[PDB]
Amino acid sequence: MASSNLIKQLQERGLVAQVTDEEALAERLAQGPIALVCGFDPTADSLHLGHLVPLLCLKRFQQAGHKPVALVGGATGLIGDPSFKAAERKLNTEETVQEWVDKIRKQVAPFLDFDCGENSAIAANNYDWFGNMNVLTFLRDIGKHFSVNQMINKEAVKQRLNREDQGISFTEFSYNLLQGYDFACLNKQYGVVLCIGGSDQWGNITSGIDLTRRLHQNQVFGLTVPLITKADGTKFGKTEGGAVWLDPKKTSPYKFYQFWINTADADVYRFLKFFTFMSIEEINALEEEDKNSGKAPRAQYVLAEQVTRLVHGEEGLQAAKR
Amino acid sequence: MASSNLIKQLQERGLVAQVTDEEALAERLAQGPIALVCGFDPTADSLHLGHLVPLLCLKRFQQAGHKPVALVGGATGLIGDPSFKAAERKLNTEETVQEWVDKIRKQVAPFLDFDCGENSAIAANNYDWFGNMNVLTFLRDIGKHFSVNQMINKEAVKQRLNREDQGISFTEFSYNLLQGYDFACLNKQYGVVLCIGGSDQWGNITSGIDLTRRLHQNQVFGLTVPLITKADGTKFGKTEGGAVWLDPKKTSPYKFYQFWINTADADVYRFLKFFTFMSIEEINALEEEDKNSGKAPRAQYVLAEQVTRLVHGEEGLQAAKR
Ligand SMILES: N[C@@H](Cc1ccc(O)c(I)c1)C(=O)O
Ligand SMILES: N[C@@H](Cc1ccc(O)c(I)c1)C(=O)O
């Protein structure tokens, strides 16, 4: 019964919002390297800061020796995840999502190692299995395992069903089945036994754990990272100018760097934990140092340098100074 | 603004449970012959008495000069209609339903005229369009027009969502979309503007009217026939021996004939109206005659003869006496 401390280490960073059976997950992680998955839906031709914590978290797992599967939702992006959203998401055309899928895949790759040991990353696209799946097969083979009674009290969509000013299409109501089947499929072909996701993904993830159990009798796990918040209560990664994109052509490395310099003192130390690979020891020493220096805090500059390098590499960091 | 009296004539027989915009439907019917549809799901290799009133009602429309489309649910029978049902219907295999589809089509044909004028009958199978429809197309192109909030308060499934001892799979919850799209598709290819169905079909039918409106901007109509009841409160067409089948190999014409002879005095005159083509005038005179004869009622014998001939022809009637 060895027990892995990886979940504890992430908890210490404040990076675990919810986790299924943390005791059993920690024991499984100590048994050896696992394949895990984190996914992103092509809702734009680029990811932005709201996708960064989960993405880096997938990298933290790889660095701990596990194998990351980076899934891009070629099919789920044609449907739209309603989870904790107030209104129906825009339906994009198949041609546009396909192009966005490619853009996101290429943008995600540099963050993971695709050529190292047995823990090399794997790129996945759920369009591989839903793209040509026929409706009767879906409704019967996947659909019979879902109780609508359970689906409607899922927290993620409850509000869309209870408030009047907030309905939900059958299209988005079905999304939970698609993402639940993705977990079963990834477990079947790649041995994925852990799914990590954003704060709003609990219900989608647990539907995947249950369906994996139902379809393959394998126990799998899920973990969500927290909704990143600012002490002043405003929305993180949201500016007058819109989202802060990970694509240098949409948001320049210079502007990306400026966004991090602009971090509030109240948020900066927490943000070093969520967005960088500096040890907890070093971040605490840095906080203590700023507390006693009588100088401007060095933390914003450190945060800006670290995340800008992570996202745009040494070249982006240099472009941030010209 | 001519007005057709066909709906009135059916009302007089006690054959109209609910009808959408009866005034506009009656005017449309007076404009000229229409294409209408009644459908049957392959839940067995034969229809039984519970399907007879709607089937004969399709024939009453044809006799009034309209064109009947007899739809057999090659795809909907792979899903299962939950309407006013207490529990999940059994999922049958594709091979078995396909064989049942053929059996039902052939059994329905003799009841309609496929070779007369411009009002010759048309056989349809929704497997033609759902059989190969891909899931993303279904969820997006059909699914975006359905509000889950509306779907859950449909009377037909409300009980499955409210009672605890009664859940519903996403599989059966989706059925309403399939039958709603069938109406739009039949309106598009055959000009069908009226759907008739059993008593439990109101919600499926209205979903079809709404989706036809949404997809093609055409106003179409629906009508349901009543749940046939017996004065003693027991279930019509249900015996110790099970259902009363329309297939002579499952329920012999002799036994079929005996079932009608066994009709209660309290039900027989109503049953002559629902199950035969005798005029209302003649049925009333027959009731008056039995009231004053001092003889056994002739009505059961007349009912037995008429329905047995309708269902098994002159040959079945003769076999009923040997
Ligand atoms: N619904 C997720 C994106 C996503 C989609 C499919 C999938 O299998 C997985 I793992 C993740 C989100 O919106 O973050
Ligand atoms: N749900 C119906 C059968 C049926 C199925 C599909 C369809 O388009 C039509 I019109 C009728 C019943 O159970 O009676």
All residues of chain A having their beta carbon less than 8 Å from the beta carbon of residue B153 are none
Domains of chain B: 1-227 (3.40.50.620), 228-322 (1.10.240.10)
| Strand positions, DSSP E, chain A | 18-19, 35-40, 67-72, 122-125, 192-197, 221-224, 238-239, 242-243
How many CB atoms within 10 Å of residue A190?
15
All residues of chain B having their beta carbon less than 8 Å from the beta carbon of residue A132 are 134
This entry's atomic model was obtained through X-ray
Nearest CA to ligand 2 atom 1: B81
- CB–CB of B147/A168 below 8 Å? yes
**Burial classification of residue A230, based on how many CB atoms lie within 10 Å of its CB (0-12 exposed, 13-18 middle, 19 or more buried):** middle
Looking at chain B, list the stretches that DSSP marks H as alpha helix, in order from N- to C-terminal side.
6-12, 22-31, 52-63, 94-108, 127-130, 135-137, 148-152, 155-162, 170-173, 175-190, 202-216, 253-261, 265-275, 280-293, 299-319
How many CB atoms within 10 Å of residue A241?
9
Indicate the DSSP class of residue B46: S
d(CA B304, CA A168): 52
Of B72, B128, B132, the residue nearest B102 (C-alpha): B72
Tokens of B34: 């229409």
| Longest CA–CA separation in chain A, Å | 68
d(CA A239, CA A159): 27
Q: Do B161 and A148 count as a contact with CB atoms less than 8 A apart?
A: yes
On the CB side of B156, how many CA atoms lie within 13 Å of its CA?
Answer: 21
Q: How far is CA A6 from the centre of its chain?
A: 17
Of B156, B191, B183, B209, the residue nearest B24 (C-alpha): B209
What residues does ligand 2 touch, defined as CB less than 6 Å away?
Answer: B 37, 39-41, 71, 73, 76, 81, 126, 179, 182, 195, 197-198, 201, 204
Q: Do B134 and A136 count as a contact with CB atoms less than 8 A apart?
A: no
Task: Give the position of tokens 């009808």.
Answer: B19
d(CA A145, CA A245): 38
d(CA A70, CA B106): 53
Indicate the DSSP class of residue A235: B
Facing residue for B78 by CB, picked from A130, A136, A152: A136
Looking at B147-235, list the stretches that DSSP marks H as alpha helix, in order from N- to C-terminal side.
148-152, 155-162, 170-173, 175-190, 202-216
d(CA B130, CA A134): 8
Facing residue for A135 by CB, picked from B134, B149, B169: B134
d(CA B315, CA B230): 29
Strand partners, B243: B238
d(CA B97, CA B130): 14
All residues of chain B having their beta carbon less than 8 Å from the beta carbon of residue A73 are none
Region of residue B194 (phi > 0: left; psi between -120 and 50: alpha; otherwise: beta): beta
d(CA B229, CA B72): 25
- CB–CB of A257/A317 below 8 Å? yes
Tokens of A49: 């800061």
d(CA B86, CA B315): 39
A48: three-class secondary structure by DSSP: strand
Judge whether B93 is closer than 8 Å to chain A, CB to CB: no
To the nearest whole Å, the CA of A167 is away from the closest chain B CA by 6
How many CB atoms within 10 Å of residue A257?
23
B123: three-class secondary structure by DSSP: strand
- CB–CB of B196/B170 below 8 Å? no
Q: Torsion angle, CA of A301/A307/A312/A315, rounded to 10 degrees?
A: 40
Give distance in angstroms: CA of A77 to centre of ligand 1: 9
